Design a protein around this ligand. Structure first.
Ligand SMILES: Nc1ncnc2c1ncn2[C@@H]1O[C@H](CSCC[C@H](N)C(=O)O)[C@@H](O)[C@H]1O
Ligand SMILES: Nc1ncnc2c1ncn2[C@@H]1O[C@H](CSCC[C@H](N)C(=O)O)[C@@H](O)[C@H]1O
Ligand SMILES: [Mg+2]
Ligand SMILES: [Mg+2]
Lengths: 242, 242
């Protein structure tokens, strides 16, 4: 629509961190992440750092954490909403068993094709079913076709932030009981801690209010148990109770 | 020497945090933690906040995360090293199924008896086997007696920080394959990011050096896969590979 530009350069928050020490974040990456990062994940991350929407790339220390959660809960079938160049997708495919299956949804296939060569070299492309679409229609169609035996073990939500609450209503019905839903960026550069935050691009302000709404909603939702973790840009782990 | 003894008043790092601001940490606790905190946990926390070593009390948001970790991996047998007043121990007991069993080890039972009224009121004292002892002799005796049927699903290490590497050699054999070992305070107030750090208490400087060595050791240990998480004072999750 007509109006102002919504490029990455038009944002204000991209360089802000939720950790107060830039030396600490680099320590975590250099000490505990990069030595454990897959060769193809390193290649995908380095090309993505050059991309015009590099700020959306999931943090590498969060990637190792998502892989740990997948292995500890022995997830076999997952769904990812918001693929971009596919770092968390490749992280998920490497963590799942050899017969693991992933449904990856993103409106932009061109982003996915940048990281697909690294996904192929890692030899886990067969686990991924990419759907070039808006997520909400795909989710709604799934609820009409999904049976209880094929419910997802794990869901990673990382697409358009203001739509998280809408995705939530479908995903607690598409994720198995005891499964996990992980919402990315639920701390939104730390701006969620304030009733008002000046200097924001209108889209960043929308997610500040939408995440402040979502965090209250998730803390009051009886269908799930939650855990908000201050890793990366913040994330909220949801475990379905019924 | 003789006197009033050791106080956390003599430590330099008690008022530090890894997050960007105190407001961000306060937002997480009030939005995402306190409405999800068991009443007996809040009672245990509020008494412990007035104790003379309240700086060692595990963070409340980290507690909910350990609970989520125990539930997603369906842990049944766990072991805790360092109980203090028992906030993480209570968080563990409430997360495990009704037939869950915990081996809790601490040198000080007087700290544990501060929290045992809350554990009993929660109705989960039957899951706990407290052992007042130094942890290393107990673990060593476990390795001569334990069989494969008694291996632990989960281990939480939160005791004397310089002994973590020694605990690691025992716990990679006491935790089952695919089980989790979680080491607390592996970021040590952010001091691990620096090769030198001024004005630390000798014990505080002792743990900065030991944690910089342990973080390098865990990242190179081929027996486990790791994930360092910037929650609370930083923790490292280790999943046993073989
Ligand atoms: N309505 C929508 N439905 C599905 N995907 C959407 C969407 N709106 C935006 N997206 C996609 O969601 C992505 C968010 S960036 C996600 C980053 C990725 N998960 C990683 O690990 O790095 C963008 O690529 C964008 O194309
Ligand atoms: N060598 C040792 N062996 C076993 N426990 C020890 C120990 N040295 C110290 N400890 C215990 O480890 C505890 C560390 S404080 C632990 C905090 C607690 N886990 C929580 O959830 O808040 C102290 O209470 C101390 O009594
Ligand atoms: Mg994200
Ligand atoms: Mg601790």
């Amino acid at each position: 629509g007509p109006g102002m530009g919504a490029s990455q350069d038009d944002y204000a928050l991209i360089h802000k961190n939720i950790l107060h020490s830039e030396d600490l974040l680099k320590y975590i990456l250099e000490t505990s992440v990069y030595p454990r990062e897959h060769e193809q994940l390193k290649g995908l991350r380095e090309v993505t750092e050059k991309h015009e929407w590099s700020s959306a790339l999931v943090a590498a220390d969060e990637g190792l954490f998502l892989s740990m959660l997948l292995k500890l809960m022995n997830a076999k079938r997952t769904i990812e909403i918001g693929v971009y160049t596919g770092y968390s997708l490749l992280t998920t495919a490497l963590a799942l068993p050899e017969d693991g299956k992933i449904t990856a949804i993103d409106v932009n296939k061109s982003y996915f094709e940048i990281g697909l060569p690294f996904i192929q070299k890692a030899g886990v492309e067969h686990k991924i079913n990419f759907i070039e679409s808006e997520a909400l229609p795909v989710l709604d169609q799934m609820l009409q076709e999904m049976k209880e035996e094929d419910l997802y073990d794990f869901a990673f939500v990382d697409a358009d932030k203001p739509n998280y609450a809408n995705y939530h209503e479908r995903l607690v019905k598409l994720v198995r009981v005891g499964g996990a839903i992980v919402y990315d960026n639920t701390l939104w550069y730390g701006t969620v801690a304030f009733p008002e935050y000046p200097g924001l691009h209108p889209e960043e302000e929308e997610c500040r209010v939408s995440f402040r709404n979502l965090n209250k909603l998730l803390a009051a939702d009886p269908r799930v148990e939650i855990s908000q973790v201050s890793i990366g840009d913040g994330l909220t782990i949801c475990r379905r109770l019924y």
